[PDB]
């Protein structure tokens, strides 16, 4: 029941993802080094990770069918509000339930609860984030479903400041109808049972995680000593 327009969308989002997410993590060496000892010892490294990942999210987003047809202003608001969410989503790819960590190929670039808690953010964020990663992993999404969810999350009609919501909604619905049809045609049961409803629920989980991150960013940002450890892009995207 997948239309050729729908199959074209899947094709585009898979390539867009493949072009902006390097599964070998080679670029992690360009980051300020990780420090495992020290309350902000991991901040430099993870700030660089986040900042790098913001760029990659933008690159993926520009390739979303219809995104280009949005105003510059609407592209800005959507990316500013979705960045940390898509970072959490795309991170599920390296997250492993084996030891509850983000395993990016090597021990230097393998981040657990202890590491992630040495960057100025509290368990109020980290605990439900890890829970989120586990709950997302268990959905065992097809990569097709994975890239559709990231794109749907980015093109959300209800983000603060969106001007032409209806168009944003038109774009998202096409992605949504692609996701729902894909699940019907390509995802065998029981893995498919209620899967769309479950993925859309992860988008609600992400709002909650976004809100809490926003709170904790404001806190830490209020100490220039901490803001100094970030990057210009991170400062511009999460608030300046
Ligand atoms: C960022 C990514 C990766 C992992 C994600 C992680 C582990 C470290 C902490 C991250 C960045 C979380 C953020 C919110 C951090 C929470 C406290 O350390 C904040 C970092 C401070 C700049 C979200 C996803 C988490 C690795 C790979 O999957 C690529 C992906 O883009």
UniProtKB/Swiss-Prot annotation:
Keywords: Cytoplasm, DNA-binding, Metal-binding, Nucleus, Receptor, Transcription, Transcription regulation, Ubl conjugation, Zinc, Zinc-finger. GO terms for cellular component: caveola; chromatin; dense fibrillar component; euchromatin; heterochromatin; nuclear matrix; nucleus; perinuclear region of cytoplasm. The chain holds residues 123 to 420 of 423 of the full protein. One of its GO terms (biological process) is negative regulation of keratinocyte proliferation. Residues 62-80 are annotated as: Interaction with coactivator LXXLL motif. GO terms for molecular function: bile acid nuclear receptor activity; calcitriol binding; DNA binding; DNA-binding transcription factor activity; lithocholic acid binding; nuclear receptor activity; nuclear retinoid X receptor binding; nuclear steroid receptor activity. Calcitriol binds at residues 21, 53, 90, 94, 121, 213. This is Vitamin D3 receptor. Ubiquitinated by UBR5, leading to its degradation: UBR5 specifically recognizes and binds ligand-bound VDR when it is not associated with coactivators (NCOAs). In presence of NCOAs, the UBR5-degron is not accessible, preventing its ubiquitination and degradation. Composed of three domains: a modulating N-terminal domain, a DNA-binding domain and a C-terminal ligand-binding domain. The 9aaTAD motif is a transactivation domain present in a large number of yeast and animal transcription factors. Belongs to the nuclear hormone receptor family. NR1 subfamily. Detected in intestine and kidney. A motif (9aaTAD) lies at residues 232-240. Residues 5-239 form the NR LBD domain. The gene is Vdr. Homodimer in the absence of bound vitamin D3. Heterodimer with RXRA after vitamin D3 binding. Interacts with MED1 and NCOA6. Interacts with MED1, NCOA1, NCOA2, NCOA3 and NCOA6 coactivators, leading to a strong increase of transcription of target genes. Interacts with the corepressor NCOR1. Interacts with SNW1. Interacts with IRX4, the interaction does not affect its transactivation activity. Interacts with CRY1. Interacts with CRY2 in a ligand-dependent manner.
